[PDB]
Write a structure and sequence with these properties.
Radius of gyration: 35 Å
Assembly: tetrameric
Name: Cas12-2
Entry title: Cryo-EM structure of Cas12-2/crRNA/Target DNA complex
Number of domains: 6
Keywords: Crispr-Cas, RNA BINDING PROTEIN-RNA-DNA complex
Strand content: 15-25%
Shape: globular
PDB class: rna binding protein/rna/dna
Number of strands: 28
Largest sheet: 6 strands, antiparallel
Structural class: alpha+beta
Length: 831
RNA sequence: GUGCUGCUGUCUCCCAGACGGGAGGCAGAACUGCACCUUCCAUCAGAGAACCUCAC
DNA sequence: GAGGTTCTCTGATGGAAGCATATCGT
DNA sequence: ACGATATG
């Protein structure tokens, strides 16, 4: 599997011949879609351009196979089935009939084809014989053939040159079943299909590639659906026998009368009947179309399709597709992705393209093009320049570095034995991310961190990135987003003022004490004039939203351009402001939804498409910029190991992205730049000091300052640096210190430690001496680990393992000191 | 190329109706900034909305 | 925050993708 | 040596 990065380039004046080739390629690809399914001789479901699903019967397969050439489709049935499953990759991966699904069209489509009657590349037999007959002594052949075969014919195979004889014997003894089926069909003279449009071999390869890949995907999904339905039915039938008697005949009538109006064993059994029945067993077949579901009309340089000669002049590409009708020259609209490109024909059927994506530096990127693909969108054509790239080299020393620091203490993986650079990364929204960088073998001055089995390290480089660029804009994106949230609730109640009378009691202080101050609307009692007073605010909401979006636009088109950061905390506030504005606009659009009225299958089908498009675009842009700043921060400091918080474990990156796809993108782009990363457990990183390794206070009024005590003097430090170091410190110490153990009580105050994870197993050994331990109580409401010779949270503190009630009070006792003392008398750490 | 990403003027369909909101098209003006692997497909779950029912 | 209702859109979590060599024959 | 197949 090569590495792949891709982009699109526009072509404007497409000649009629290429348009015809495009459409014919889709039509033939649809023909392949249909003919493979027909040869499967298994009925399926076709989803038309509309939502309707059609049950294509066996007759529609039979008559189509009749048209395609098979005048007696039933008589040759098993043989067609075997060929069909071969091109769709339903045979064994080793010794496959067609390693590339395309390679069947020589036998399927042509008229005088020699495919299937060759031995020149038969694996390891003809090549071995041809090699030995030249410069070997007829003795290592025995070793080579015994090695693979662990018969007397092999003696004659090397007794003479006999290439044709061995080829014939291999084609006889070794018959890949998918090709034997095709030869049998062509012997009957029914296999060469009548392709509706006349295309040469190269274009038929390209069509069959896409048709076959669509069939392979759909077949895999169908098999998954069938297997899942079978397994769920197995679970239901296992549960049905169980212990429940035939009394389950009654919950049927019970559910009937319930749904007409609309027990543990009865309810659970009911779910299985409903869950099993509604699940589909088969997927839908979506046939290819020119405009509905386009396929890439691929043009390869080895046989996949018509060859192309990619060139470049100035700041744009020059594509020439060598069609059978003639050479067709296309010029490319210049792309900032492949800006100022240079092209070069290589010695391996490829073009070496060197271009420049970004505009900050002039860094030139190198890739190889080996296939170009053609699609259309909104009647406008495109080529997919799907190129390759070699990722940056990662030292074998980094791999031994990553394995060592990842391992729990009870594993003994080797020391890195070199000077690595480790990174600490926290992730937030206002503080997009913060970092701490340490160098192994070099501790000079800073927050010194233990390193497992090595000397300590000092974090020289520390910083907070992302952040709020302009203070005013961030506050305005927050005032409006608060208003947009509170208007959606307000007009839910507003209608009930007019729809009902005097509302209720639970709402009364919910409307007055919370919603009126929020939506900033004066309350009028007369219903007719409540529509006007609510409409003018929604106008005023848009009128100030447009202002904000325009000032957000001008972050890139003023003299403030130089100060505009790569990523800001405004990227996330805008996303929520777009989100809340969407709900409010949706709610006001249904201000007329009155009495009992519901959303219909029709109505308005394009509602708020501009906002949804802006929502997805802003997110995709935010994550790409977020990854760049992280990777830019990693490369600059010489980092090769990145410790990240496992965020899988409002004001969070969650509710904007899935918990994982954020981390996946960062790791992928780090690995392209030759930087390995690991996910560190993000427990107690924001509540534990990185200096004293003791619990502190995360200030609620100010979420950037973390208070702890050192030498009985209260200190403060940035809570993003504090967590960034605590993520890196955990990695370098191999999670040596834990701050929480789960324990369960059996009797008389002996809380038994629940060992679930291997990190707890190793930890107890370094203190107790056994892979298990107990908590004995002491005089001052504390505990102590003992350890046993062969669930309630507990918090460490000063070697005492206090409980949640007394851990909260210790945190609370420190808060009172902070509030009493004040930030003026609490010194700063970083600088 | 696709986005971040809008402004002015003018024009057409739609939902409310005389408060307002949502799709779009051409026309210029302003701006030389940041980033950018993406195509296709099938299942099964969520978000919020909104109508019928609750006092949390 | 109780509890099916009917629809769009993610969103989940998968699936298939984005070419090599080999020789004959002129 | 390049083209026309063919198949790892």
């Amino acid at each position: 599997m090569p590495s792949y990065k891709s982009s699109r380039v526009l072509v404007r004046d497409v000649p009629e011949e290429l348009v015809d080739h495009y459409e014919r390629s889709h039509r033939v690809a649809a023909f392949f879609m249909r003919l493979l399914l027909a040869m499967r001789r298994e009925p399926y479901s076709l989803r038309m351009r509309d939502g309707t699903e059609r049950e294509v019967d066996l007759d529609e397969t039979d008559d189509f196979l009749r048209s395609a050439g098979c005048e007696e489709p039933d008589a040759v049935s098993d043989d067609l089935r075997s060929f069909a499953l071969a091109v769709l990759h339903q045979d064994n991966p080793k010794k496959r009939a067609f390693l590339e699904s395309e390679n069947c069209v020589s036998i399927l489509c042509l008229e005088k084809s020699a495919s299937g009657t060759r031995y020149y590349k038969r694996p390891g037999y003809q090549l071995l014989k041809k090699a030995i007959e030249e410069e070997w002594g007829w003795d290592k052949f025995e070793a080579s053939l015994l090695d693979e075969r662990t018969m007397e014919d092999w003696r004659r195979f090397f007794a003479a040159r006999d290439p044709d004889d061995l080829g014939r014997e291999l084609l006889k003894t070794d018959t890949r079943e998918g090709m034997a089926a095709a030869l049998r069909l062509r012997e009957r003279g029914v296999f060469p299909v009548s392709v509706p449009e006349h295309l040469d071999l190269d274009s038929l390869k390209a069509a069959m590639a896409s048709a076959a890949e669509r069939l392979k995907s759909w077949l895999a999904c169908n098999q998954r659906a069938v297997d899942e339905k079978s397994e769920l039915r197995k679970r239901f039938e296992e549960a049905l026998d169980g212990v429940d008697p035939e009394k389950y005949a009654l919950f049927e009538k019970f559910a009937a009368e319930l749904q007409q109006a609309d027990f543990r064993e009865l309810g659970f059994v009911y779910l299985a009947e409903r869950k099993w029945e509604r699940r589909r067993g088969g997927a839908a077949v979506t046939l290819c179309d020119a405009d509905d579901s386009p396929i890439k009309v691929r043009f390869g340089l080895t046989g996949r399709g018509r060859k192309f000669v990619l060139s470049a002049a100035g700041s744009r590409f020059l594509i020439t597709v060598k069609l059978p009708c003639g050479d067709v020259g296309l010029t490319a609209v210049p792309s900032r992705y492949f800006w100022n490109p240079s092209v070069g024909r290589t010695t391996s059927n490829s073009f070496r393209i060197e271009f420049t994506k970004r505009t900050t530096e002039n860094r030139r990127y190198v890739g190889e093009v080996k296939e170009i693909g053609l699609v259309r969108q909104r009647g406008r054509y495109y080529f997919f320049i799907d190129y390759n790239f070699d990722p940056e080299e990662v030292s074998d020393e980094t791999k031994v570095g990553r394995a060592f620091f990842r391992a729990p203490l009870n594993e003994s993986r080797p020391k890195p034995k070199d000077k690595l650079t480790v990174m600490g990364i926290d992730l937030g929204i206002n503080p997009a991310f913060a970092f701490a960088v340490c160098t192994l073998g070099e501790c000079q001055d800073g927050i010194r961190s233990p390193v497992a089995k090595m000397e300590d390290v000092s974090f020289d480089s520390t910083g907070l990135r992302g952040g709020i660029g302009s203070q005013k804009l961030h506050r305005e994106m927050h005032n409006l987003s608060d208003r947009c949230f509170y208007g959606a609730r307000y007009i839910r109640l507003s209608k009930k003022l007019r729809d009902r009378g005097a509302l209720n009691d639970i709402e009364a202080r919910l409307l007055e004490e919370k919603y009126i101050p929020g939506f900033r609307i004066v309350h009028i009692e007369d219903a007719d004039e409540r529509r006007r007073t609510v409409g003018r605010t929604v106008k005023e909401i848009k009128q100030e939203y447009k202002r904000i979006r325009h000032q957000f636009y001008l972050r890139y088109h003023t003299s403030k351009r130089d100060r505009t950061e790569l990523i800001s905390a405004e990227y996330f506030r805008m996303l929520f402001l777009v989100k809340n504005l969407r709900n409010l606009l949706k709610s006001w659009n249904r201000y007329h939804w009155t009495t009992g009225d519901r959303e219909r299958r029709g109505g308005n089908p394009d509602e708020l498409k501009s906002y949804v498009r802006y929502y997805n675009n802003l997110r995709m842009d935010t994550l790409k910029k977020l990854t760049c700043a992280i990777v830019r921060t990693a490369k600059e400091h010489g980092a090769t190991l990145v410790a990240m918080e496992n965020i899988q474990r409002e004001n969070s990156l969650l509710s904007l992205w899935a918990p994982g796809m954020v981390l996946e993108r960062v790791e992928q782009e780090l690995k392209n730049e030759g930087i390995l990363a690991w996910e560190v457990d993000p427990r107690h990183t924001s509540q534990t000091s990185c200096i004293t390794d003791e619990f502190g206070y995360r200030s609620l009024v100010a979420k950037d300052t973390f208070y702890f005590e050192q030498d009985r003097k209260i200190h403060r430090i940035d809570a993003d640096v504090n967590a960034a170091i605590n993520i890196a410190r955990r990695f370098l110490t191999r999670y040596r210190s834990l701050t929480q153990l789960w324990a369960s009580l059996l009797d008389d105050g002996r809380y038994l430690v629940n060992v679930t994870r291997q990190h707890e197993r190793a930890y107890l050994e370094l203190q107790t001496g056994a892979p298990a331990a107990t908590l004995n109580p002491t005089a001052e409401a504390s505990y102590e680990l003992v350890g046993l010779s062969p669930r309630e949270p507990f918090y460490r503190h000063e070697g005492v393992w206090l409980t949640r009630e007394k851990h909260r009070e210790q945190v609370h006792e420190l808060r009172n000191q902070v509030l009493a003392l004040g930030n003026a008398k609490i010194p700063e750490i970083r600088t």
